[PDB]
Amino acid sequence: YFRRQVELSTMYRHMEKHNYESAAEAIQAVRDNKLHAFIWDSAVLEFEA
Amino acid sequence: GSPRHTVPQCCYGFCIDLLIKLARTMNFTYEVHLVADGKFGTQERVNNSNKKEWNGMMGELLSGQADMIVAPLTINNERAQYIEFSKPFKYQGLTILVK
Amino acid sequence: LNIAVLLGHSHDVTERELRNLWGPEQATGLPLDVNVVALLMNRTDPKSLITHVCDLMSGARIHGLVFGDDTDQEAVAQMLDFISSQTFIPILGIAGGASMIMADKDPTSTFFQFGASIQQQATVMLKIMQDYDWHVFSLVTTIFPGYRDFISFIKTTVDNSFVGWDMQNVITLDTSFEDAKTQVQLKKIHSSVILLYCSKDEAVLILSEARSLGLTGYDFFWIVPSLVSGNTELIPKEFPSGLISVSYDDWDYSLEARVRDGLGILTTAASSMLEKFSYIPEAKASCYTPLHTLHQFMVNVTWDGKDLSFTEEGYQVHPRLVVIVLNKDREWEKVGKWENQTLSLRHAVWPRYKSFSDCEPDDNHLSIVTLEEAPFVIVEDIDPLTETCVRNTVPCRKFVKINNSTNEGMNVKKCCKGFCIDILKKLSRTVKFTYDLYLVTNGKHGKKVNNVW
Amino acid sequence: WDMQNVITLDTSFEDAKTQVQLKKIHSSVILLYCSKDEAVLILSEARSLG
Amino acid sequence: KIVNIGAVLSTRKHEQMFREAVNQANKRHGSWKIQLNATSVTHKPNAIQMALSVCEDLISSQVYAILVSHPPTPNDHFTPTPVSYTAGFYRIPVLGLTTRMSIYSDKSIHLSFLRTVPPYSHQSSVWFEMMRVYNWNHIILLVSDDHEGRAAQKRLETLLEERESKAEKVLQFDPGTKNVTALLMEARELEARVIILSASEDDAATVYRAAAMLNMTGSGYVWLVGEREISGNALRYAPDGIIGLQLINGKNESAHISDAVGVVAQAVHELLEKENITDPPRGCVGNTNIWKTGPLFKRVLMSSKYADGVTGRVEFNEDGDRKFANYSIMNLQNRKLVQVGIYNGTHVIPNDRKIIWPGGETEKPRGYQMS
């Protein structure tokens, strides 16, 4: 979805250095402030918040 | 990390109850397995032959190892060109998680 | 072992330099027996191709055969494949009509050629079309055979690439004549780039129809395979000056430099098979079925550092193709050379050759210079995973100098974006012009530096 | 009125430049103005052009 | 005033009928003074000496068309290849008459070859039609022979282009292997049960034994094979009720030879209308120059339509094949091949017989066990 849109490719060139594999490891990384933001599906985030 | 560690496991929650509702309504049994990685599935070129591949859930689907994907499956144009979808059951968007 | 190199050619190149091509060659002898016999011939009939082959097989059981040619007969490769299937002798083709590609081999056949398949050349042509973003094209193929596999290979190649090939439906021809419905299908072409698969006899009629239907325009491109563009001498006047073809007949790589590699391939395969099986000489007794062969063994080889590996189908892994054009002097220029696995070109500045025939005058190509600025002209490298400027970016070139001891540099193709790029795209939408974009290498915006801007 | 170019026809028999001028046309409605002896050839060419 | 015609034919007793058909070729075709000259050569156990005997005879004899037919070779290759190669070196039309290998369809390999018998790939031209008859929309294609089975799979996918459907699963493997049950056990889990097979006899016996040992020949397992899979010991090991095809006038060689002679005769009398009658020279002695009107003479031979003979309505397609052949649909009624339907050029016409399926009743098994 961020690869198709030609005006959102730059963030793609950020996220190619930082993408992860599971949601829970990203939750733990942003939980201890190892990350600083997390773009994700709204239902999973509204559940875990 | 794990070369081969597959044990029988207990799966439950939302979509499992959806599948139980479908097997209650439509007359069929099933056998739930999971995917062999942690990827939904994208459109990636393999090393040679100039050929695209789909990995993940579409990878185990289009290889014939599955017949129905019941998952948080995001509907887009690319997957719908290759597999058919049903009508959605839960609507969302995209947002940010902060502290 | 005993290896014979027979050469059938009317262009008289002597045979004693082949004996000179054996002394310092293979100085580190890995086999225990290397012997060569060089023979010349001026006849190419199959009677000689049976009789002299049986004589050389009776001539101390020659295990290696290398044949070259200068004619245009592809049935020689059809004969030698059957002879290699019957005699259990690895036979190699070099040039002329002997190196022309045949489709399906036999598992009992050990015959091999120095040439590229129609699929590999289709891959090269589509790489050319990808490097110029010629995404809107068509396909005009006649009923000359191999065409169904060619169309199927193109349709499988389109659905497995990050390009997004706009494919107009494949116009096919009934006969070589100017039929009614074939002319109707040819008039439906409104695109520019045309992949034209036909024979040398058909091309004159097809391009005469193209001039008769206005398909030889200054924007209309034409890309053809190797079989239609054969002899460098016989080029008819019905070809447009600006036709691009691909053929591996390089003028630098001569016949001796190729047989010098082929003999090394044969000796390397025999010496490596000696490491696994002992009895390397296994030949047939007389013209009038072993197990250990070199057919299933020489998958890879590295002679003189050059990679010369083979495939399961019986082709070359790395064939040395040459991308030629037809310039305004009605000649064939060595324009593009093939890289390691990728493709390089010399003319990144693509020349017009705007008049294909004598009189095609037009004024819709524009040369546009610009300069890198942070909100307007953002110039970045091409996306390496796709090799494609994505559709907000446009192609451009920059003469980046390699070193500063000399003035040599490369016109590297890059991607432009920003604010003025959208302005130029909307101008090309409205005013409907063809534009060429390039960065400046002289310097900044402008200053009258001693009456020189 | 969204108007395309003024396509003129010198001769319908030359079949090279006028056919390119007809290839420029991709709009829906076309106003035609010629003689009766020429319209047969013009529409016969435009039939094979689709 | 002479036309040389070469013959590369199996037996000496059919050569008399060949010469009789040559004599009848100039019989009703007027008082024109053309002659037809015959030369017959037979089997050789060695393959290079076949072409060695053919070349200096027929090329020096300046033949225009060569009729080649050799069924009774104990070698299982069945290759008239070197005669066709030698005559295609100078673009001389070899007309194959008995072999049916699909390697001859590629005219990029056989540059001037024509044939009057259909190859096995056009059996697929019936099979899609079978899918049109008994409501079959999900088939399982199995290919053993990798030589011509790629062309058969390509022809079936060409016939499935208009419907825009595919098979459920296609499988290919090594011709000659034995441990083939791993393909069938993965074919067991498929929901459809219509099974179509293309194989040779040495693989047909193996896959029949594999389907017998897995009990994959019972109810629902509908089979559909061709002519190779119903001959040899494969007919002995055949599962009961199998549906195959039989060539009408396929094994009757002499009537097909006479029909081919009539075809060549009307083609020569049609070609004599045109001028520029060039001759293929003595190419065996030094003459490397090929015959100039090769493709012209071949294109004359392409669009020739006929209405007389035992074959009768014989016509050649864009590939030079037998247009609209007649196949008798055969069923294995208690290990006895019974004709249970015919097929002319466009459509399957059933007879009044009973189609005993490999499963149970005579009603068609809709073998779509949706899981």
Ligand SMILES: *[C@@H]1O[C@H](CO)[C@@H](O[C@@H]2O[C@H](CO)[C@@H](O)[C@H](O)[C@H]2NC(C)=O)[C@H](O)[C@H]1NC(C)=O
């Ligand atoms: C084959 O035999 C049939 C027997 O009737 C011929 O008749 C045609 O059969 C097809 C079957 O689909 C029909 O669609 C046609 O309408 C029939 N034609 C007529 C006028 O009866 C058929 O002509 C025979 N030959 C061919 C072409 O294979």
Ligand SMILES: *[C@@H]1O[C@H](CO)[C@@H](O)[C@H](O)[C@H]1NC(C)=O
């Ligand atoms: C599962 O995960 C780890 C890491 O992949 C693996 O080494 C091991 O087999 C398993 N250990 C646990 C925690 O069950």
Ligand SMILES: *[C@@H]1O[C@H](CO)[C@@H](O)[C@H](O)[C@H]1NC(C)=O
């Ligand atoms: C449901 O499935 C069972 C098992 O296949 C079958 O026997 C039965 O007829 C079906 N009954 C219903 C309620 O549809």
Ligand SMILES: *[C@@H]1O[C@H](CO)[C@@H](O)[C@H](O)[C@H]1NC(C)=O
């Ligand atoms: C190519 O293969 C190697 C070895 O399996 C692997 O490391 C690499 O990621 C592959 N590249 C891709 C994904 O095309």
Ligand SMILES: *[C@@H]1O[C@H](CO)[C@@H](O)[C@H](O)[C@H]1NC(C)=O
């Ligand atoms: C090659 O040409 C020469 C000169 O004309 C001739 O003597 C010879 O017969 C030809 N080749 C052979 C070996 O027959």
Ligand SMILES: *[C@@H]1O[C@H](CO)[C@@H](O)[C@H](O)[C@H]1NC(C)=O
């Ligand atoms: C060539 O092939 C062999 C296998 O026979 C392989 O082990 C080797 O790596 C290849 N050559 C090199 C040096 O890469």
Ligand SMILES: *[C@@H]1O[C@H](CO)[C@@H](O)[C@H](O)[C@H]1NC(C)=O
């Ligand atoms: C390029 O050549 C190198 C050897 O210089 C070798 O790795 C390979 O054959 C080629 N492929 C790559 C890595 O581009």
Ligand SMILES: *[C@@H]1O[C@H](CO)[C@@H](O)[C@H](O)[C@H]1NC(C)=O
């Ligand atoms: C340009 O000149 C500089 C001087 O230091 C040199 O380092 C560089 O290699 C030269 N080449 C280029 C990149 O133009």
Ligand SMILES: *[C@@H]1O[C@H](CO)[C@@H](O)[C@H](O)[C@H]1NC(C)=O
């Ligand atoms: C020339 O340029 C290349 C790439 O910048 C560099 O590796 C090389 O050292 C340069 N040579 C000199 C002497 O400038």
Ligand SMILES: *[C@@H]1O[C@H](CO)[C@@H](O)[C@H](O)[C@H]1NC(C)=O
């Ligand atoms: C024509 O026919 C005879 C019949 O025996 C055959 O032997 C020979 O090839 C031909 N002879 C002539 C007259 O050329």
Ligand SMILES: *[C@@H]1O[C@H](CO)[C@@H](O)[C@H](O)[C@H]1NC(C)=O
């Ligand atoms: C084929 O392979 C499987 C592997 O388990 C084996 O069980 C079976 O007996 C084999 N069949 C034959 C005929 O070799």
Ligand SMILES: *[C@@H]1O[C@H](CO)[C@@H](O)[C@H](O)[C@H]1NC(C)=O
């Ligand atoms: C024969 O068919 C039956 C059907 O249930 C099956 O149980 C059995 O395994 C089959 N025989 C063999 C040896 O596969």
Ligand SMILES: *[C@@H]1O[C@H](CO)[C@@H](O)[C@H](O)[C@H]1NC(C)=O
């Ligand atoms: C072959 O056909 C001919 C002509 O009808 C006939 O004379 C001959 O008996 C047939 N042979 C058989 C029995 O197949």
Ligand SMILES: *[C@@H]1O[C@H](CO)[C@@H](O)[C@H](O)[C@H]1NC(C)=O
């Ligand atoms: C024969 O070929 C020549 C080639 O120029 C042609 O001019 C001539 O008309 C042809 N003769 C006939 C009537 O076939």
Ligand SMILES: *[C@@H]1O[C@H](CO)[C@@H](O)[C@H](O)[C@H]1NC(C)=O
């Ligand atoms: C096939 O059958 C039709 C109808 O009888 C006939 O016209 C045609 O000649 C037959 N072809 C053969 C194989 O003789």
